[PDB]
Amino acid sequence: AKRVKATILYATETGKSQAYAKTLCEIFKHAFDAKAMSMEEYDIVHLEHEALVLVVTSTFGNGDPPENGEKFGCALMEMRHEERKSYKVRFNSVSGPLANVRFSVFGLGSRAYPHFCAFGHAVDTLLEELGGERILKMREGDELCGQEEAFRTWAKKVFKAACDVFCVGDDVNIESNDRSWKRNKFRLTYVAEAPDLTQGLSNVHKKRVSAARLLSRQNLQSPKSSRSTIFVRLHTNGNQELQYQPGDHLGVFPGNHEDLVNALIERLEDAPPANHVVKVEMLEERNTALGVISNWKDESRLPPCTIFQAFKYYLDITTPPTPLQLQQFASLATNEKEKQRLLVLSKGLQEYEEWKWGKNPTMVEVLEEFPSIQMPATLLLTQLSLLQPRYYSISSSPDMYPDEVHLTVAIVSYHTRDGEGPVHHGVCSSWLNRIQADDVVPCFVRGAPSFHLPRNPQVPCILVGPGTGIAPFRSFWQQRQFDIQHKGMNPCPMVLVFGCRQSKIDHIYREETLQAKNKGVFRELYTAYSREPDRPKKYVQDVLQEQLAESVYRALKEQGGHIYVCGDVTMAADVLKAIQRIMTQQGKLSEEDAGVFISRLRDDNRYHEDIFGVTLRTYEVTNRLRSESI
Amino acid sequence: RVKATILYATETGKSQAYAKTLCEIFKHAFDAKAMSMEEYDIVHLEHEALVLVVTSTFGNGDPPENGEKFGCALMEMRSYKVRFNVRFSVFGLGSRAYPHFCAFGHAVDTLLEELGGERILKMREGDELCGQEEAFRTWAKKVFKAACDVFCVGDDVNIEKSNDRSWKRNKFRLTYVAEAPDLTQGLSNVHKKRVSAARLLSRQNLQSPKSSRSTIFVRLHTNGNQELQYQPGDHLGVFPGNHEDLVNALIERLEDAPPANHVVKVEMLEERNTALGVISNWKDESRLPPCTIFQAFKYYLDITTPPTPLQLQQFASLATNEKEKQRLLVLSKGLQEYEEWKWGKNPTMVEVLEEFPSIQMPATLLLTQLSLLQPRYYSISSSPDMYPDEVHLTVAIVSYHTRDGEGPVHHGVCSSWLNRIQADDVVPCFVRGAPSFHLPRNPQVPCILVGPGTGIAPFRSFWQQRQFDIQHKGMNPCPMVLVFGCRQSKIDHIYREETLQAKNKGVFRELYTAYSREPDRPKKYVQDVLQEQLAESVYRALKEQGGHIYVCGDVTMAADVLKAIQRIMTQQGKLSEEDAGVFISRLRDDNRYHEDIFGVTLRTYEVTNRLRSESI
Ligand SMILES: Cc1cc2nc3c(=O)[nH]c(=O)nc-3n(C[C@H](O)[C@H](O)[C@H](O)COP(=O)(O)OP(=O)(O)OC[C@H]3O[C@@H](n4cnc5c(N)ncnc54)[C@H](O)[C@@H]3O)c2cc1C
Ligand SMILES: Cc1cc2nc3c(=O)[nH]c(=O)nc-3n(C[C@H](O)[C@H](O)[C@H](O)COP(=O)(O)OP(=O)(O)OC[C@H]3O[C@@H](n4cnc5c(N)ncnc54)[C@H](O)[C@@H]3O)c2cc1C
Ligand SMILES: NC(=O)c1ccc[n+]([C@@H]2O[C@H](COP(=O)([O-])OP(=O)(O)OC[C@H]3O[C@@H](n4cnc5c(N)ncnc54)[C@H](OP(=O)(O)O)[C@@H]3O)[C@@H](O)[C@H]2O)c1
Ligand SMILES: NC(=O)c1ccc[n+]([C@@H]2O[C@H](COP(=O)([O-])OP(=O)(O)OC[C@H]3O[C@@H](n4cnc5c(N)ncnc54)[C@H](OP(=O)(O)O)[C@@H]3O)[C@@H](O)[C@H]2O)c1
Ligand SMILES: Cc1cc2nc3c(=O)[nH]c(=O)nc-3n(C[C@H](O)[C@H](O)[C@H](O)COP(=O)(O)O)c2cc1C
Ligand SMILES: Cc1cc2nc3c(=O)[nH]c(=O)nc-3n(C[C@H](O)[C@H](O)[C@H](O)COP(=O)(O)O)c2cc1C
Ligand SMILES: O=S([O-])[O-]
Ligand SMILES: O=S([O-])[O-]
């Protein structure tokens, strides 16, 4: 029972928890026999016999487990569950089998969301009730301020605390450094077989990606708008992989703009032409009883391909470097002043914060700001993060549009340095806005069972969502419309609470919702204008408290109706207060009965929320929170 | 060298094996490669010099799943059901027990031509029931020489054709690992598809206790798993566990030393020749995940399917006797001797090692040469609207005696596993849509549901759905007709009270049952109820009412039914066997005549024999 095993479990949606977990395993390799596994890869049957367990997990959606964390969270939730309390009740709330085990939790999250680091807190809370002995109190990493930084602190303490408790680490010492990057470690070797895009992305992200097809794209806003929102039609080609129900999302895999990809490639020192199928092989120095066995292997992260296809379809080249990545960049800088700035930023303290949040630098902008960096083709290919797919609410009814998938996409573009800097185009939205019909569209369907229309047609539904948060409601109404016209049903009509900036500029799908109302689908259509010169600023929160307070109340309290909120997390949080008020001031219930009534609706799946994350007033919201919390 | 792309389609993995071997032969005179019709750009096709196609046919003449993309691509680039139900040559695996024999291979062969394609050799067929591996080896040599001269290489090593990718003794080793994945995750890695962990809620027999046979009702909980969303008509792919006794008998007969409780992995020696030796390293085989050998045999590997001729030859060089090593050699040549052996005894791997006890079996040969345990498909018997977060299955428990009922009992792998797993045990499975076996979008048209025994399975979701659209969505769909079939009304009438009830609620207009072993009345099949009781309701539906007819179950039955309806078209409406037969062709492409083939599930022994006798 020597060489204590340290099991590092992680859950992630974009790769941050996974990275930190790797870094954490590397550290524990010093005094312990450590392993880093995704929560889904791990077999819950070993847990009770685990000596030490370290959890690094983010939280997603509406205070939920990352998708690859759901199974593990249910499992715990199960072993621990005499009856009561739901996950949504205790951990995302409105205001022993593991005796042998020692653990500690680090959770990633954002103060921009209601239930900050919810999944980390549930796991942390749950391992303790199951009989586990917590080493360090749970620490939280805020994506808005010092996330990578707070990881180090905790990583340091927890290691020290583990060494102390297990009484090992009298030979491990006070301390880049690991599988980071080193020139005699990674090598790009030639290959003659380059997979197909959708097949390569399936390997890379361990899931089946189907090739969809672009049929058309149209502007949903006036040509006189400064903004742009596009209606996109895709042909699924029969593929049963792409079956969906109204409410579900489509995950899409973009391509970085070629110019940016090229600028980047033309800045590498030693790099084959940006065209030669090259696999990446790494010098892996294993270790045996004989001594140390060293040899070449396949990194096996990216599939065989040209560096161009790699930077274009598989690697994140626009997300600002983490402090770690800057550290590897620094040791490549050949200019005194130019290299110290790199080391100052490597800290993740304020300078980093200001630089990142101020310049929102792409990989290219960084190499160009510190032109004395000798960038190795293999450092990027192995250190950059994978290009993540972006999710989009499906905007079509599969009955009204068989073998078709529609999307409503806000075109993200903004100026850096608070309007002074150049333009940065969102990766997926700008891609979806320029692909041609011959272009393949890598995607998959991710069902959203908490956001499907009710099984019972005769109950009232209130659909709340500003801007593109209307996207899924378009599948709701098209679907209800088809039901009426062809299935011979008379479902209780619904109410739509939309919200935008200007009557004849932003009200997307206006006529389309009109036509749907005349057909019985909707009882009434409410709209909140926020930048109308002719009146005051109104938000769906307002339309709800000023013109539906009664309907809302009668719908939810007597008619057994449902309310659906979709879009920006700030709005959704506001809509939850507007409803808590309407419930209080329209039924005489304190912040108690109103809160518990809501908390009940959710419980019974009658209060639905589909969070897009932070999409509205991004600058002002991120700015307020960033500051206010440091 | 010329580049030869060998494209293969496969479900149970036989065509895959054939292509990899085909690749090892074409290596001699060509630059040959092998991959799925999915792991390939259909755009590169036209820029190919030589394309070899090895593909099986599934469904009812349908392309295997991984051969769906490719199929329609050649179709548009150049309906399917109608017609079939660069240099290149096709070899299609199949079975003469199915109507549209090698339908996919014959379709791909036809369409390649219609795309600037020149055929080398006449497309061959490989009947799973008689001389499959035999016709392949042949066509294999005949097409090699054929392309060899077509592309003009002269006198080269045309005698080399037991090859290289075949197990040797220091090309493989089992290195310990202290971290083995969870089963469902391991399976997702092995089969490259998302497999979810579902849990058993309950199982109950739907046949009378006084029955000799047995069918079970199975309820699984999806656990809110979005990956497990389905529609009535869809199938659930399930991964079972082999029985422990057979797993431990197999381990205890093993030569290699791996304790069974230790996690291991299979590394293979990757060597790259040089001018004075070789530059090499041990890479992970990476077919199976790290797991205990007990777990590989119980959950990842097929230890019951009879050894192929290729796997026997290998056992040959491992027998320490002479008769044994010789019988092995005889059987290694998939001919009369081997076919009689296999079909007659249908030996598990364990029985093979016991019929030939001098074989010294190393663990790394089984772990690398045995086929992957394939998942079994089951028609979902529940409506998702009626049973949220639930998946129900109707499962016939397969169990037969070898050597024509004279030998030991052999249990169906998945059916028997599903028949003994305990509540809450994990059930790895996934959902595979059947877009061609879904209820019509128009619920105001009549549907005629035909299917005996377990063939009823998808209809229980059809009628639970309709019952739900009625009792809850407030719609009034055109009532349906159920044409069922079983052995004895008092024994085999599974879900009798349920279909009965579905009638009382307006789901079903009428319920027609056919019995085949009622010791009173004659042996009536469902094809006999169509003609002898509804020949008119069927004609009016498929001709005037814009109706739909769904056929589900054994391929033989489904065929007797097609040939029946085609006549009900002649007789009742007056059109010839080419005017009614092609009208059903228009039905199957208009998607109003639905078929869902389970394979050969009925009268297996009787049927598959006459068929061996058919071709032989
Ligand atoms: C379940 C779900 C459903 C969704 N459905 C939809 C949908 O239906 N329709 C839709 O349009 N979107 C939807 N989204 C949002 C969407 O997926 C993408 O986040 C969005 O299109 C932007 O992606 P991008 O790839 O274009 O830009 P990305 O390049 O990734 O860039 C966005 C990042 O830009 C920064 N950026 C943006 N604005 C500014 C600014 N003003 N100032 C400084 N920096 C800024 C932020 O740091 C932000 O994270 C959904 C998200 C989720 C999780
Ligand atoms: C789309 C689809 C849907 C299906 N739906 C269902 C369903 O809903 N319900 C259901 O019960 N089944 C269904 N099946 C059949 C099912 O999937 C399995 O084939 C079946 O349960 C048996 O699997 P097993 O794994 O138990 O036996 P397996 O071990 O694979 O064994 C069967 C093999 O045994 C031989 N064997 C069987 N009987 C005999 C005999 N009498 N004499 C000599 N040799 C014999 C055959 O060679 C056969 O291949 C479906 C198949 C498909 C393709
Ligand atoms: N700044 C840029 O150049 C730029 C460019 C591309 C995309 N983007 C971003 O990408 C997003 C996509 O646009 P979109 O179509 O979804 O919507 P949008 O036009 O940004 O706004 C949606 C509507 O909801 C309102 N709203 C804002 N905050 C709210 C809150 N906290 N609670 C309730 N309602 C609220 C808005 O009011 P307001 O009048 O207050 O906005 C607006 O009327 C944009 O909203 C924007 O943040 C910005
Ligand atoms: N051979 C065995 O002893 C044995 C035992 C247990 C399970 N099994 C297998 O497991 C399967 C599951 O049983 P099941 O519930 O699906 O059904 P089943 O009991 O095998 O029979 C389904 C019904 O369909 C009839 N039928 C048979 N062949 C037909 C054809 N060619 N065309 C139209 N109708 C036909 C049968 O009549 P008949 O009376 O003419 O068969 C029977 O009444 C079995 O059918 C069988 O394959 C076999
Ligand atoms: C749609 C979306 C929903 C999110 N929901 C929450 C949330 O409820 N609580 C929280 O603390 N953070 C939330 N976040 C922030 C992530 O948890 C955080 O960005 C984290 O750094 C991502 O970590 P990962 O890369 O490991 O998955 C959310 C982010 C997105 C894009
Ligand atoms: C449900 C099912 C349906 C089948 N349908 C056909 C068919 O229409 N035509 C044919 O020639 N073979 C058919 N077969 C036989 C396969 O083509 C044959 O068993 C082949 O050996 C499987 O090869 P594979 O393992 O490479 O996919 C079918 C087999 C099953 C299990
Ligand atoms: O300051 S740099 O971006 O020129
Ligand atoms: O094989 S069953 O007992 O898990």
Swiss-Prot record, chain B:
Protein name: Nitric oxide synthase 1
Localisation: Cell membrane, Sarcolemma; Cell projection, Dendritic spine
Record: residues binding FAD: H235, R376, Y377, Y378, S379, T394, A396, Y400, V413, C414, S415
Protein's job: Produces nitric oxide (NO) which is a messenger molecule with diverse functions throughout the body. In the brain and peripheral nervous system, NO displays many properties of a neurotransmitter. Inhibitory transmitter for non-adrenergic and non-cholinergic nerves in the colorectum. Probably has nitrosylase activity and mediates cysteine S-nitrosylation of cytoplasmic target proteins such SRR. Inhibitory transmitter for non-adrenergic and non-cholinergic nerves in the colorectum.
Domain FAD-binding FR-type, residue spans: 193-440
Parent-record interval covered: 752 to 1413 of 1429
Binding residues annotated for NADP(+), in chain numbering: R213, S399, T454, R487, S516, R517, K523, Y525, Q527, D560, T601, R603
Name of the gene: Nos1
Natural source organism: Rattus norvegicus (Rat)
PTM info: Ubiquitinated; mediated by STUB1/CHIP in the presence of Hsp70 and Hsp40 (in vitro).
UniProt comment concerning the protein's domains: The PDZ domain participates in protein-protein interaction, and is responsible for targeting nNos to synaptic membranes. Mediates interaction with VAC14.
Highest rank taxon of the organism: Eukaryota
